[PDB]
Amino acid sequence: XXXXXXXXXXXXXXXXXXXXXXXXXXXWXX
Amino acid sequence: EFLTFMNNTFEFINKITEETDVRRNLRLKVYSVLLDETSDKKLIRNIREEFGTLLEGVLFFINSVTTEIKEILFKVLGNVLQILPVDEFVNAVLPLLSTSTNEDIRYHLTLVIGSKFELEGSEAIPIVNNVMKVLLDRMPLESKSVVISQVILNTMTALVSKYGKKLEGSILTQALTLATEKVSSDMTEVKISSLALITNCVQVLGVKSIAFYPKIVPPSIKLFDASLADSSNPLKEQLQVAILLLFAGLIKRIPSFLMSNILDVLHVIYFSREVDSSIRLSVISLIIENIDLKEVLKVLFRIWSTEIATSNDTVAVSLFLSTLESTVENIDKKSATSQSPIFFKLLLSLFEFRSISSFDNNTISRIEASVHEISNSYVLKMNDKVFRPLF
Amino acid sequence: EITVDGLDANQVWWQVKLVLDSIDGDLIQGIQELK
Amino acid sequence: KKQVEQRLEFYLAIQEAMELYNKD
Amino acid sequence: QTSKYQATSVVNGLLSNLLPGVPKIRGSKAQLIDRNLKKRVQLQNRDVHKIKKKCKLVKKKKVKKHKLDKEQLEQLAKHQVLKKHQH
RNA sequence: CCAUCUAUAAUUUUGAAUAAAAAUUUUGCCGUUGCUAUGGC
């Protein structure tokens, strides 16, 4: 269900070159 | 002699009209006739026609008056306006605007029409649609007289401010088109009243007014540039506020469409000399809380290099500093890292302000003090990866 | 209507998003009934 | 008695627009 | 003179609607820089929401009082049309 | 707190002049009495 939607969404993003990923916000550390 | 007789006569007219018993009060006798279904309609028409002649007569004396007799005629007029209700008042007075041939009487007639709606509610909606259509129709005719041209716009502004949303859409779209044309009027008063009407119409319509956006924002920006040149205008403070309040109205209602013209908004705010700093500094705070902070940061660099840096204007510099510190203390971490190359490009320019500044040492050292505290806040709220190339 | 006269590209898209976002909810419900 | 007396005392919006027009 | 009074009234009307707390229409430069910077925070801490509420209540009472006056005057006249319709 | 830098005030140049500009450095309130002094609360 939800996995199938992501697979379809991944195929959609795969249809074009989208391949978008969530950004990661880092902080001053170490 | 005669004047003493005149003073006593209007006291005599005042005593009769004064609402000191059902049979005694003239106001209650009129309303019962309206209630009575069996009362002939032709009799109701006479009451409407006779009231208009009475209202015009008292305005004629007030217009052409003597301090004591002036006060009495206002006592008499106050009694007259309460004789019949709002529904019949609008029917019995609106036709009289076209009929009346005196500039003064039509000026007074438009004020009283607006006053009746001050204390009304949503029951007056069908009535107000009638009033608005009449006022819109007379605006082309009354273009010659500035005072009447101004007053009709002011009443329309009040009627659109109060229960304006519930008015029919055609009137609102017709009123906005009228204002956009009258902003170009040569008289400053018509500009101020037209700018006030656009602000209220845009508030009611919201996004639906985007069709008129090319007729609102660009002409206003040119109007501001002309406002600076004519510093002798006695209404210079009111005009610059009106242009400023126009943007404040549409910074709250259409932020996204104004993101493109945000630079010209900031140009108006900084260099609006006549307006008080409180008014200017308040309309900044709308921009931060309503417009994307990424675009403001990009525009703060262009405005500084082009205008503020060479302005040698104290209030403009301080207002720029207030915008820059508000943006950084509100801009989130994700936007701060993305927009970092722009901010540091601005930062080097702010550091070099000492070379070109015409101010004395204390000012520049105070300006730099704020530049350093914002830079620390912005360098915090970043990470190693983005800042190492910038360092 | 969407106005494209005397408006830049960014302003036009804002009109598109508001129109399409509202229509998406009703449109999606329509396909579910049809399906 | 005078001392007691000293203690005793111790214890239209449209209208404004119109006349401006007559001045004008 | 009416030209000036009408312009101020219209503008003052917008200030109340959009910027409630802001006032209406009626030295060293380093000092001037600070005052604006201090004005920024103290304007931010103003309780405009309380200012809007007071204006709404003041208007609401007057509208409410006027509404009762219409209601009461209607009843007195309604009984009279009733009275005469009997006779 | 001190110093430093400003601000205010003063002499000076262009200047009929305004103007800029280098430059430098007795009462809380109420009276009376002078041109300063003392009566009431």
Side-chain angles (χ1 to χ4, degrees):
Chain A
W28 295 103
Chain B
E1 298 78 5
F2 182 97
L3 305 178
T4 310
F5 164 89
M6 294 299 291
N7 178 19
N8 293 322
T9 303
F10 289 112
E11 286 291 332
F12 181 84
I13 295 169
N14 192 15
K15 281 302 190 43
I16 303 177
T17 61
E18 267 168 13
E19 187 176 4
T20 299
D21 185 9
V22 300
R23 313 164 187 174
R24 296 289 185 273
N25 188 1
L26 177 54
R27 181 184 189 180
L28 188 153
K29 294 178 70 167
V30 174
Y31 182 76
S32 63
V33 169
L34 274 296
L35 289 174
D36 204 297
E37 190 277 331
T38 68
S39 282
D40 182 13
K41 277 73 69 177
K42 300 187 291 298
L43 188 153
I44 301 172
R45 291 185 317 91
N46 264 326
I47 297 167
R48 299 188 310 92
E49 290 149 70
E50 290 297 330
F51 169 76
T53 308
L54 186 61
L55 177 54
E56 195 279 334
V58 295
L59 290 175
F60 178 88
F61 290 109
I62 293 164
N63 169 38
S64 180
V65 174
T66 58
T67 64
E68 68 281 18
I69 62 170
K70 182 62 66 68
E71 200 161 56
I72 297 161
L73 295 173
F74 286 111
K75 299 297 294 298
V76 174
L77 182 69
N79 306 343
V80 167
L81 298 177
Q82 267 192 300
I83 290 174
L84 53 82
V86 179
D87 174 68
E88 306 302 326
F89 187 94
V90 166
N91 305 340
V93 169
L94 278 181
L96 202 49
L97 297 173
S98 306
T99 301
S100 176
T101 64
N102 197 295
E103 294 293 328
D104 297 327
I105 304 290
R106 282 185 323 230
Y107 166 84
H108 305 311
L109 281 164
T110 308
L111 302 173
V112 297
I113 294 163
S115 71
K116 295 291 288 187
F117 294 105
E118 271 174 48
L119 290 167
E120 286 292 321
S122 185
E123 66 270 20
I125 294 297
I127 301 299
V128 172
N129 293 331
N130 192 359
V131 172
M132 288 284 307
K133 182 175 74 67
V134 169
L135 291 177
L136 289 167
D137 295 354
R138 302 288 277 97
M139 187 66 204
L141 292 64
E142 301 295 351
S143 57
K144 299 298 293 295
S145 182
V146 184
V147 294
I148 302 182
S149 185
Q150 178 174 10
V151 170
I152 295 171
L153 286 166
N154 301 353
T155 55
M156 266 204 297
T157 310
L159 295 178
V160 173
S161 175
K162 192 192 178 186
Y163 50 67
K165 295 179 170 56
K166 294 184 286 296
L167 267 69
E168 182 65 26
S170 303
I171 293 288
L172 294 174
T173 303
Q174 180 175 354
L176 184 49
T177 315
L178 180 62
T180 53
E181 298 167 356
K182 298 289 180 289
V183 163
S184 307
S185 172
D186 304 354
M187 295 299 291
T188 299
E189 296 86 9
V190 180
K191 303 173 201 165
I192 300 168
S193 298
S194 304
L195 292 164
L197 188 52
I198 294 169
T199 314
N200 290 105
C201 287
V202 164
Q203 268 208 344
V204 166
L205 297 173
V207 185
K208 300 176 177 55
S209 68
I210 193 65
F212 298 89
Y213 172 85
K215 289 190 175 186
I216 290 174
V217 168
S220 72
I221 297 157
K222 280 73 176 175
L223 179 59
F224 168 81
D225 295 332
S227 87
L228 298 174
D230 55 358
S231 281
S232 62
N233 192 355
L235 286 169
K236 62 185 184 294
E237 193 198 41
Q238 294 82 4
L239 179 57
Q240 282 197 2
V241 172
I243 303 166
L244 207 54
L245 270 284
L246 188 141
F247 292 121
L250 58 82
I251 288 155
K252 296 172 72 171
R253 299 290 304 135
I254 45 169
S256 303
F257 309 95
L258 191 76
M259 293 177 71
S260 296
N261 287 113
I262 191 60
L263 197 152
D264 302 283
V265 176
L266 271 69
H267 175 91
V268 170
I269 300 167
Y270 298 149
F271 300 95
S272 175
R273 296 295 87 195
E274 310 308 328
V275 178
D276 190 0
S277 292
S278 307
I279 296 158
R280 282 180 277 181
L281 208 49
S282 295
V283 62
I284 300 299
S285 72
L286 300 178
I287 292 172
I288 297 89
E289 71 181 2
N290 289 327
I291 295 174
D292 180 19
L293 277 296
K294 291 175 71 174
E295 302 295 329
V296 180
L297 189 51
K298 293 189 286 185
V299 168
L300 281 171
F301 173 57
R302 194 151 56 119
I303 191 72
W304 166 260
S305 305
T306 303
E307 299 179 353
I308 303 292
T310 67
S311 64
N312 293 355
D313 189 12
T314 307
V315 182
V317 170
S318 65
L319 290 171
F320 174 89
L321 268 64
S322 70
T323 60
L324 187 53
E325 67 174 46
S326 304
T327 58
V328 299
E329 74 185 4
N330 283 128
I331 194 173
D332 59 352
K333 290 173 73 168
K334 277 74 70 177
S335 301
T337 61
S338 50
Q339 295 292 320
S340 47
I342 301 299
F343 170 82
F344 286 72
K345 189 73 72 62
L346 172 55
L347 195 65
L348 282 71
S349 307
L350 288 162
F351 283 152
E352 299 162 28
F353 177 58
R354 183 172 284 274
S355 311
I356 59 168
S357 174
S358 63
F359 308 122
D360 60 346
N361 188 23
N362 290 8
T363 54
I364 302 168
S365 298
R366 181 59 184 89
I367 292 165
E368 288 169 350
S370 62
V371 168
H372 279 286
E373 81 187 7
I374 63 187
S375 77
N376 304 154
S377 310
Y378 197 105
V379 167
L380 275 54
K381 215 162 53 181
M382 281 183 62
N383 64 47
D384 282 320
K385 278 74 176 175
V386 298
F387 183 66
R388 187 164 289 251
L390 268 292
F391 176 82
Chain C
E1 180 162 30
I2 190 167
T3 51
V4 304
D5 281 18
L7 279 74
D8 61 355
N10 190 359
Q11 281 161 356
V12 172
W13 192 73
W14 292 129
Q15 307 180 62
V16 170
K17 182 175 73 175
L18 302 176
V19 168
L20 293 193
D21 278 340
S22 297
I23 286 163
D24 281 339
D26 291 329
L27 177 63
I28 295 153
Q29 197 270 335
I31 297 169
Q32 300 162 351
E33 301 178 317
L34 201 158
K35 188 179 287 294
Chain D
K1 184 175 78 71
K2 291 177 181 178
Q3 184 166 5
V4 175
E5 291 179 354
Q6 296 294 321
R7 182 65 60 84
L8 198 43
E9 66 89 21
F10 182 75
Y11 291 170
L12 294 174
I14 61 171
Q15 183 177 0
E16 189 169 306
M18 305 204 150
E19 84 275 18
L20 298 151
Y21 195 18
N22 307 323
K23 294 181 183 293
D24 171 68
Chain E
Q1 183 62 255
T2 63
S3 169
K4 294 175 73 68
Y5 163 73
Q6 285 291 312
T8 56
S9 66
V10 171
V11 169
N12 287 357
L14 302 175
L15 289 173
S16 295
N17 302 343
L18 309 190
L19 304 176
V22 175
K24 289 186 168 187
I25 303 176
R26 291 186 293 111
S28 176
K29 297 175 298 309
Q31 194 168 20
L32 175 54
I33 298 300
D34 293 340
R35 288 166 172 176
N36 298 350
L37 268 75
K38 299 296 175 54
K39 278 175 188 178
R40 201 260 313 172
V41 62
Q42 66 89 29
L43 286 177
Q44 264 183 1
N45 303 345
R46 193 182 271 155
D47 189 358
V48 298
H49 186 273
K50 186 263 286 181
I51 305 173
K52 304 166 194 171
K53 181 180 296 184
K54 284 173 72 177
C55 296
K56 161 191 170 188
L57 270 72
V58 169
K59 293 187 288 186
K60 175 167 56 175
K61 297 154 192 166
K62 292 181 179 179
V63 174
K64 185 55 155 51
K65 176 180 172 184
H66 170 258
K67 185 182 180 300
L68 282 71
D69 189 358
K70 185 263 284 180
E71 293 279 22
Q72 185 65 257
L73 194 147
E74 185 292 334
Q75 295 300 335
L76 276 75
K78 182 64 69 175
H79 293 91
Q80 296 294 322
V81 62
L82 183 149
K83 248 167 197 184
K84 65 184 286 295
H85 270 208
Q86 294 171 181
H87 187 273

